[PDB]
Amino acid sequence: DQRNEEKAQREANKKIEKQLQKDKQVYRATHRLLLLGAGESGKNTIVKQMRILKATKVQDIKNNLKEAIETIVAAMSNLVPPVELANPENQFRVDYILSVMNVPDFDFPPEFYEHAKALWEDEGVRACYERSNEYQLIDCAQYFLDKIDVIKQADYVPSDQDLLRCRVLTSGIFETKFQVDKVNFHMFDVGAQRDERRKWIQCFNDVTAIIFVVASSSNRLQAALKLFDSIWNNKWLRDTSVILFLNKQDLLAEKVLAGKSKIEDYFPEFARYTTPEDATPEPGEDPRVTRAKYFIRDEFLRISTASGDGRHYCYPHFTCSVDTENIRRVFNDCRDIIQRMHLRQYELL
Amino acid sequence: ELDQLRQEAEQLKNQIRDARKACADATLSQITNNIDPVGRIQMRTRRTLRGHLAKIYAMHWGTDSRLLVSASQDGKLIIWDSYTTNKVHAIPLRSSWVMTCAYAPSGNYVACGGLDNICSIYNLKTREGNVRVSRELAGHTGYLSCCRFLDDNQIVTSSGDTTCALWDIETGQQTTTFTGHTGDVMSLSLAPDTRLFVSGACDASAKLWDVREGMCRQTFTGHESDINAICFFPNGNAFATGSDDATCRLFDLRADQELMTYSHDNIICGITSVSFSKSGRLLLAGYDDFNCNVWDALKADRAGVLAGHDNRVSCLGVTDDGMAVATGSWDSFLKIWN
Amino acid sequence: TVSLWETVQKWREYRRQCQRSLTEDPPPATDLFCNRTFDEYACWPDGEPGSFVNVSCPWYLPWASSVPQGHVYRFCTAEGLWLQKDNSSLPWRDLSECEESPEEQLLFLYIIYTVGYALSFSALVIASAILLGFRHLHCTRNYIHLNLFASFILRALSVFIKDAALKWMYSTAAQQHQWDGLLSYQDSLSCRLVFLLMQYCVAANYYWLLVEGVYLYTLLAFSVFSEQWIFRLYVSIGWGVPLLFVVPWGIVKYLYEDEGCWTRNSNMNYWLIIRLPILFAIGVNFLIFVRVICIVVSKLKANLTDIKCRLAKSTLTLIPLLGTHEVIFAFVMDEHARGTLRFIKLFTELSFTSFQGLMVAILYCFVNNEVQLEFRKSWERWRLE
Amino acid sequence: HAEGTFTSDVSSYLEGQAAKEFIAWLVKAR
Amino acid sequence: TASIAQARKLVEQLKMEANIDRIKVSKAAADLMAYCEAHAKEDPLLTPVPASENPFR
Amino acid sequence: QVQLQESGGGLVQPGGSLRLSCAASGFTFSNYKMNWVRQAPGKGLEWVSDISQSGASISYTGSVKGRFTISRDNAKNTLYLQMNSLKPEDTAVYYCARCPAPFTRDCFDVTSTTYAYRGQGTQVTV
């Protein structure tokens, strides 16, 4: 049976080689993308649109938010030194929360957010918080309380930061699939991974591009530059192109309009910076906001232009987390990446 | 007070330092000074295993020294027949980002896992003959970097969440958790009796664990950067680590410190994988420079080079009978060396 | 045009026409009439003594239109025989009258297009070994190059075989007085097949420069086709399509214009069957040449004298791969080209086509950084030994 | 293509320079 | 603070591994040498086997 | 055993001066890129300054540029941070952080919460 089982071995092999050949065609025809974002980057909202047109954890965040305030206010009278409120006009705010708590399937009305937010600036309500050591309170309580103004919004999608505080994520990696002009894309974004990336990021050395989403107008912007500087110069990622989404242009526009100079104090060279003359502002926007957004772009290109060498490229894009044009930018960038990869094999560039 | 506990940690750290210098009055390079060198070890590629579409991240030899499983990040476990180069099974994985694979000593299962944070057990000798997922072990909160079977029903995993876990495969439950590392855990190696294992982490330290008691016995420092690779000496009384500081080191469990450092001035890249030959006279180490160096583990001289890969050497394994070395690479090839 | 085949036939009819004539002519019967004859140039009758025996210049001559009225003289002596030139038996004859009243410009071409085809043939067997040798270089791009390399080898090979037939037919035999073997070879199918393998090997070389352009075009058109299916299509286009007009050309010149061993394009409306499909491959590969260069300029402006230099190195490197050097002078048809323009056309199309195979091997095997890296990596490993 | 043009150039030219040889052989034949 | 809880655990781990029996290094090195000699002849990477018995021939 | 021990620090007046020191041990100091990283009360860790292996290449977070000076002594295995004209927004625990791997341009994770190759910190109070 030495030759009998050698013909069964080599025939099971060629069957696998046929399946491996169909595998190869599917693997080659798909573009793989890594989505890396800042904590408040707004990455997830961009995924939310790339998906609808697994971030469904919006309600769970609200659960812990509602469950947090209820314990704090219900413990006010329970404490042996009972805690008094700083403003008596917040009395009715406590009343409402004391009733609506411990009910199934709460809707979270804005009036609830009004009492919840208004109670948190109250010193007396906060006074019991430092005594939350003596009673039982959720770990991620003060984090979400400061963030209610973000959560009141209709379009709220939990950032990764938000998901780490709670124990919502069970999945190491999330995958999004989409198709632009009959070309398939596999977008990945890490879920339950620690903030140390230096080991698992080497897995993505052969992706078509890394989609790097920056929470523009935030330091958190110097932090994004250092992460991009680490990705750009990594030994294993210096043949990987980076698609750079400078995300919160709409919030960046508002702060420069108002006079919120967190940008200039964090970057003293913003004072002696002038908009490049070949800039293309969106007609109907402040000549100061086009300066602020082109300054952040010029920070990433300072890193990018050094040590590029034609191995990989940076594609900066001013974006907004609510845009259907974003998948097209990725598709166009990936076409340029693939064309340059092919042109470099023929030594045409 | 926290600051009082810190200053007690330093003096206990000085006491172990002093209790280790007490027994380190002779070096391994004095004991092994008259030992005649092994000679130029010249291995050649005997088999190149082609069929993976993307870089190979891990491999494991089966205990019969003929079948080996290899994981690539195109999403495939391939089980090869190294003698005839015929693929026995090709397993498509649910998550493509596999970072480790294990062959059961009984030969009936493989395991794999990666950035999905799950270790997946596959039944090879099933009812109707097609490989299917039998159990999925979830509970790690970081990527699964290494998995090693104890028997058909237990498996140890190391994870990016800085812990290792002992599993019961029949019920899918974590029988034990091994905490104590500060960086994430990159590799583990079982002792020949399987009652202990050692883990190497991204905090430049290695730890020895009692499998049945769940606690750390000894901690080994000396490396300067993240430890990528760990492997037990054939008798279970020593192990060798490979780190990003470009050196390999050898530690003895009973002297409770390191004995040997394997480094050269021209070697400035991290070690990805280590493995001993059957007798433990050679230490084989894969490198980021696309090469594998053979080290005379008793004299710390380089004895040879495995020089046939076009990309990073990612994994490395020696058969149980000691007949061949398998090297996996980011160029998507497996090479078998003699 | 006069074929050596046709000059012989007309002469043979001149034998028959006179061989019967010689026996028929009744004698003058007169005393001492010098005898009629045919001495393998022109045949005299009996000519009475004391006279010039005058014959029209023979009609089989190639230059027979040139001199419709002319005369070779032979003299009949008063004794009644043919007059004799001194120092031999050959009768006095006058070839002052029937005598007739380029090459060098056609040999410098042969000098410079043999050397080009020889240094291309050499460089392309070397470059095919390097591509076929190293396993790390096995990809579909290098499989297109290998097939293209085999077209230049076959084209350079078949031009050597053809130039050792043309030389044998005329330079060897006809300069050695073989009117028996030379004419017979022309009849052999072997003479036809060598100038039928030359048409196929030239056509298959244009259609593999077309596969190189088409393949590079699909790569840049962001079109990820099935790799398996297209490669069998590319082999069937480079090697298979040339049979779809070369073979229909062979049978047409076998039935209708089967003369002079197919070497001469005596009728130019059948030369279209080969020329026109090749102009399609040359035409299409020039539109790919412009679209590829238009893509390269778009890429160079983004990562902006320097762009002008990189564009020149890109355009000049791409030209041998696609064979677009002959769009300069390939839409000047053979029919319509005459005079110096039939040298310079033939110069820039023989001096460049011959060296084009060499330039492809240098640019796509010898200076290619994936080969120069694989050479050093195969030497640095050999420094271990 | 250039090859067929040049080949028909030399074949036409040699064929002729060989019909000149045939006439010369005839004149010299006897 | 939660940081004092991991400091107490760190100190308690440093007592369990300070009170262990460590042997003489040259003695521990002597057994590594002694193991590699008792198994030198059954190591095919050290001493190559004849091509008859090498299954990757 | 990689060990980083920050020195200097302590209470200082606004506009004052301080010089933090980092006594490193257990690794080849000259092979690694070194960083200063700080954690203000309430906020997370953030990068202040880095210096390359030789000491020629230097960078700073923008809010300290012109006021802080980083320097290393490769012979003495020491990192320095000269803090001139301190503002109360400089009150932080200051950590000396090593890049995880030698001979690299990239420097991952030094601002991570549980980064191994970081010191315990000196409290600077302005």
User: Residue holding tokens 């004149």?
Assistant: D27
A279 Cα distance to chain centroid: 27
Closest CA to A244 of A312, A336, A305, A314: A314
Resolution of the solved structure (Å): 2.5
Please compute Rg for chain D using Cα positions.
Answer: 13
Phi and psi, residue B298, nearest 5°: -95, -25
* Burial status of residue A2 (CB atoms within 10 A of its CB: 0-12, 13-18, 19 or more): exposed
Amino acid found at B40: R
Instruction: Check: CB of residue C75 under 8 Å from CB of residue C90.
Output: no
Q: Is C269 helix (H, G, I), strand (E, B) or coil?
A: coil
What CA–CA distances, in Å, run from B311 to A207, B115, B308?
Answer: 16, 22, 9
Closest CA to C55 of C64, C40, C44, C66: C44
Domain coverage including residue C363: 103-384
Long-range contacts of C87-94 (CB under 8 A, 24+ apart): C90/D30, C91/C39
Cβ partners under 8 Å of residue A278, min gap 6: none
Half-sphere exposure of F51 (CA within 13 A, CB side): 19
- What the block records as the tokens of A285 is 């926007």
User: Residue holding tokens 């040449």?
Assistant: C289
H/E element, B13: helix B2-23
Q: Is B216 helix (H, G, I), strand (E, B) or coil?
A: strand
Structural domains for chain B: 2-337 (2.130.10.10)
Q: Residue-wise over F102-119: b if at least 16 C-beta within 10 A, else e? A: bbbbbbbbbbbeebbbbb
- What the block records as the tokens of B72 is 């690539």
What CA–CA distances, in Å, run from C96 to C60, C67, C75?
Answer: 18, 13, 15
Phi and psi, residue B243, nearest 5°: -125, 170
- What the block records as the tokens of A95 is 């009343």
Alpha-helical (H) ranges within A75-147 are 91-100, 110-120, 123-129, 142-145
User: May I ask the CATH architecture of the domain A58-162?
Assistant: Orthogonal Bundle (1.10)
CB-CB neighbors (< 8 A) of F120 in chain B: 6
Q: Residue-wise over F89-99: b if at least 16 C-beta within 10 A, else e? A: ebbbbbbbbbb
What CA–CA distances, in Å, run from B109 to A47, B79, B115, B131, C5?
Answer: 37, 11, 21, 9, 84
What CA–CA distances, in Å, run from C235 to C127, C232, C281?
Answer: 20, 5, 15
Give the dihedral of Cα atoms A112, A113, A119, A125; nearest 10 deg: 80
Chain A contact probe: residue of F106, F112, F114, F118 with most A CBs at under 10 A: F106
Which of A:199-218 have CB within 8 Å of B? Answer: 199-200, 203, 205-206
What CA–CA distances, in Å, run from A277 to A274, C346, C362?
Answer: 9, 54, 44
Judged by CB atoms closer than 8 Å, whether chains meet at C8 and D30 is answered as: no
The reply to whether F2 touches chain B by the CB within 8 Å rule is: yes
Number of domains in chain F: 1
| Strand partners of residue B335 | B48, B327
Closest CA to F90 of F48, F31, F27, F54: F48
Judged by CB atoms closer than 8 Å, whether chains meet at D10 and C106 is answered as: yes
Closest CA to C85 of D30, D29, D24: D30
Instruction: Check: CB of residue B256 under 8 Å from CB of residue B301.
Output: no
CA–CA dist A177, A32 (Å, integer): 9
Cβ partners under 8 Å of residue A307, min gap 6: A232, A233, A238, F105
Number of DSSP helices (H) and strands (E) in chain D, helices first = 1, 0
Please compute Rg for chain A using Cα positions.
Answer: 26
The reply to whether A229 touches chain F by the CB within 8 Å rule is: yes
CA–CA dist B80, B67 (Å, integer): 6
C105 Cα distance to chain centroid: 15
Number of domains in chain C: 1
Domain coverage including residue F74: 3-124
Instruction: Check: CB of residue C300 under 8 Å from CB of residue C325.
Output: no
Phi and psi, residue C236, nearest 5°: -75, -15
Per-domain residue ranges for chain E?
A: 1-57
Count other Cβ atoms within 10 Å, centred on residue B290.
18
Closest CA to D5 of C237, C355, C348: C348
Instruction: Check: CB of residue B227 under 8 Å from CB of residue B242.
Output: yes
CA–CA dist F94, B184 (Å, integer): 24
CA–CA dist F39, A91 (Å, integer): 38
- What is the DSSP pairing of strand A209-214 with strand A241-246? parallel
How was this model experimentally determined?
A: cryo-EM
Phi and psi, residue B64, nearest 5°: -85, 0
Instruction: Check: CB of residue A153 under 8 Å from CB of residue A322.
Output: no
- Name chain E's partners: 3 or more CB pairs within 8 A: B
Phi and psi, residue A138, nearest 5°: -65, 150
Provide the phi-psi class of F8: left if phi over 0, else alpha when psi is between -120 and 50, else beta: left
Q: Is C172 helix (H, G, I), strand (E, B) or coil?
A: helix
Cβ partners under 8 Å of residue C34, min gap 6: C46, C47, C49, C53, C76, C77, C80, C81, C82
- What the block records as the tokens of A241 is 């192109």
CA–CA dist C270, D4 (Å, integer): 12
Chains B & C: contacts with CB separation below 8 Å: 6
Judged by CB atoms closer than 8 Å, whether chains meet at C326 and D30 is answered as: no
Catalytic residue set of A: 40, 45, 167, 189, 193
Instruction: Check: CB of residue A71 under 8 Å from CB of residue A136.
Output: yes
Cβ partners under 8 Å of residue C269, min gap 6: none
Judged by CB atoms closer than 8 Å, whether chains meet at C265 and D20 is answered as: no
Instruction: Check: CB of residue C201 under 8 Å from CB of residue C157.
Output: yes
CATH number for position F87: 2.60.40.10
CB-CB neighbors (< 8 A) of B246 in chain F: 102
Instruction: Check: CB of residue E47 under 8 Å from CB of residue E40.
Output: yes
Instruction: Check: CB of residue A323 under 8 Å from CB of residue A253.
Output: no
Cβ partners under 8 Å of residue A8, min gap 6: none
Instruction: Check: CB of residue A47 under 8 Å from CB of residue A159.
Output: no
Closest CA to C239 of C205, C283, C284: C205
Instruction: Check: CB of residue F47 under 8 Å from CB of residue F39.
Output: no
CA–CA dist A304, A315 (Å, integer): 10
User: Residue holding tokens 């023979």?
Assistant: C58
Cβ partners under 8 Å of residue C156, min gap 6: C117, C118, C120, C121, C124, C354, C357
CA–CA dist A75, C68 (Å, integer): 135
DSSP string, C89-117: SSBPB--SSS-----GGGTHHHHHHHHHH
CA torsion sign for B105, B106, B110, B115 is negative
Q: Considering the domain boundaries, does residue C28 fall inside one?
A: no
Phi and psi, residue C208, nearest 5°: -95, -25
Nearest by CB to B203, from F26, F102, F116: name it: F116
Instruction: Check: CB of residue F119 under 8 Å from CB of residue F96.
Output: yes
Phi and psi, residue A103, nearest 5°: -125, 150
CA–CA dist B125, B225 (Å, integer): 42
Closest CA to F95 of F56, F57, F54, F46: F46
The reply to whether A273 touches chain F by the CB within 8 Å rule is: no
Q: Is F49 helix (H, G, I), strand (E, B) or coil?
A: strand
Phi and psi, residue B195, nearest 5°: -80, -20
Closest CA to D8 of B153, C359, C195, A339: C195
| Strand partners of residue A186 | A32, A177
B37 Cα distance to chain centroid: 26
CA–CA dist A76, A98 (Å, integer): 11
Closest CA to C267 of F36, C259, A193, A300: C259
Cβ partners under 8 Å of residue E33, min gap 6: B31, B32, B35, B298
* Burial status of residue D4 (CB atoms within 10 A of its CB: 0-12, 13-18, 19 or more): buried
Positions of E strands within A191-332: 209-214, 241-246, 314-318
Alpha-helical (H) ranges within chain C are 4-24, 108-133, 140-162, 166, 181-187, 189-220, 227-235, 243-255, 271-302, 306-322, 341-361, 369-380
CA–CA dist A319, A37 (Å, integer): 13
Breaks (C-N over 2.5 A) in chain D follow: none
User: Residue holding tokens 């062979």?
Assistant: C250
Phi and psi, residue C258, nearest 5°: -85, 75
CA–CA dist B134, C278 (Å, integer): 62
Instruction: Check: CB of residue C297 under 8 Å from CB of residue C311.
Output: yes
Cβ partners under 8 Å of residue C151, min gap 6: C201, C204, C205, C208, C209, C238
H/E element, B188: strand B185-190
CA torsion sign for F24, F28, F30, F33 is negative
CA–CA dist B20, B14 (Å, integer): 10
Give CA angle at C123 (C122, C128), nearest 5°: 105
CA–CA dist E8, C186 (Å, integer): 105
CA–CA dist C377, C136 (Å, integer): 11
CA–CA dist A192, B139 (Å, integer): 11
CB-CB neighbors (< 8 A) of C296 in chain A: 343, 348-349
Count other Cβ atoms within 10 Å, centred on residue A23.
18
Instruction: Check: CB of residue A87 under 8 Å from CB of residue A121.
Output: no
CA–CA dist B144, B186 (Å, integer): 9
User: Residue holding tokens 């140890």?
Assistant: B156
Q: What is the DSSP letter of A270?
A: G
- What the block records as the tokens of F111 is 């601002």
- What the block records as the tokens of B327 is 């090297």
Q: What is the DSSP letter of C317?
A: H
Instruction: Check: CB of residue C152 under 8 Å from CB of residue C128.
Output: no
Cβ partners under 8 Å of residue F5, min gap 6: F22, F23, F24, F25, F119, F120
CA torsion sign for B27, B28, B33, B39 is negative
Q: Residue-wise over A58-96: b if at least 16 C-beta within 10 A, else e? A: eeebbebbbebbbbbbebbeeeeeebebeeeebeebbeb
Amino acid found at C210: L
Closest CA to A43 of A139, A140, A138, A157: A157
The reply to whether F66 touches chain B by the CB within 8 Å rule is: no
What CA–CA distances, in Å, run from A323 to A40, A47, A283, C96, F21?
Answer: 17, 11, 18, 98, 49
CA–CA dist C326, C380 (Å, integer): 42
CB-CB neighbors (< 8 A) of C136 in chain B: 310
User: Residue holding tokens 């393949």?
Assistant: C215
CA–CA dist A102, B73 (Å, integer): 47
CA torsion sign for A13, A15, A18, A23 is negative
Judged by CB atoms closer than 8 Å, whether chains meet at F27 and B245 is answered as: yes
Judged by CB atoms closer than 8 Å, whether chains meet at F62 and A223 is answered as: no
